[PDB]
Subunit: 61 residues, 6 copies
Amino acid sequence: VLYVGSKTKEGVVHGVATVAEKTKEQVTNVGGAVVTGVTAVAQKTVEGAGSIAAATGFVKK
Amino acid sequence: VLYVGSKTKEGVVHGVATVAEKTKEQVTNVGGAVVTGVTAVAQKTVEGAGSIAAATGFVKK
Amino acid sequence: VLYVGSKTKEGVVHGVATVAEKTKEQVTNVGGAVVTGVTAVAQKTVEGAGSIAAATGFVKK
Amino acid sequence: VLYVGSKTKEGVVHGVATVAEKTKEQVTNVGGAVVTGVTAVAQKTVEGAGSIAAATGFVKK
Amino acid sequence: VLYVGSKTKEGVVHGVATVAEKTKEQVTNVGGAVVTGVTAVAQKTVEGAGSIAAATGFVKK
Amino acid sequence: VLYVGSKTKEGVVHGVATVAEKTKEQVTNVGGAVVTGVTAVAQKTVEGAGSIAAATGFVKK
């Protein structure tokens, strides 16, 4: 059971942002969802044994 | 059970954004969904053994 | 069971956006849906063992 | 059970940001969700023995 | 059971920030979620023996 | 049971920051979650036996 409510006159919002000028290699990496607004709500659930999650930037062999 | 409600006079919203001028390689990578508005809601569920998720930037052999 | 409601006088919204000036390689990559509006809602469900998801930027052998 | 409520006249929010000029290599890596707004709420649950999470910057073999 | 409430006239919030000019290598790494707003709430739970978490900067051999 | 309330005319908050001009290697690493606002709340729970947590800077072989 979840209840949320809100009131506002003004507002401005920014999520993820990136700038690069002269870089050779640059990485932005995310595993979940990305959710955005004046009001934002997010939920998840997983069931069963042996679950794995593996957020990784890069690999060189 | 989920309940959401909202009231507002003004607002401005931005999701994911990216700029690159002279970079050699650049990557933006996301594993879930992307949801955006003045009000935004998102939900997910997974069932059964041995679930896997593997969000990766890049690989070189 | 889900309930959502809204009232607003003015508003402006932007989804995913990209700019590249003189770059050699650039990649924007997404695994779910992209949903956008003044009000936005999204739902998903998966059933059965051995589910797999594999959002990857690029690969060089 | 969770209850939340808010009242505000003005506000400005920034989620995650990044600037890089002449660096050779640079990485931003995150394992969970990113959630943002004037009001933000986030929840997760996992059930089972073999549970693993492995957030890593990079590897060189 | 949790109850939270707020009233405020003005406010400014910055979550995570990072700036790099001429560095060879630079890493920011996080194991959980990132949550940010004028009011912010986060919760989590894990069930079952032998649970592992291993947030690491980098490895070389 | 937990209860929280607040009242404020003005406030400014910075979560985590990092600056590096000419360094060879710099690492910022965190094993938990990062949570930030004018009012902020965080909670965790683990049940079982034989748990491990291993937050580390870097390793060289």
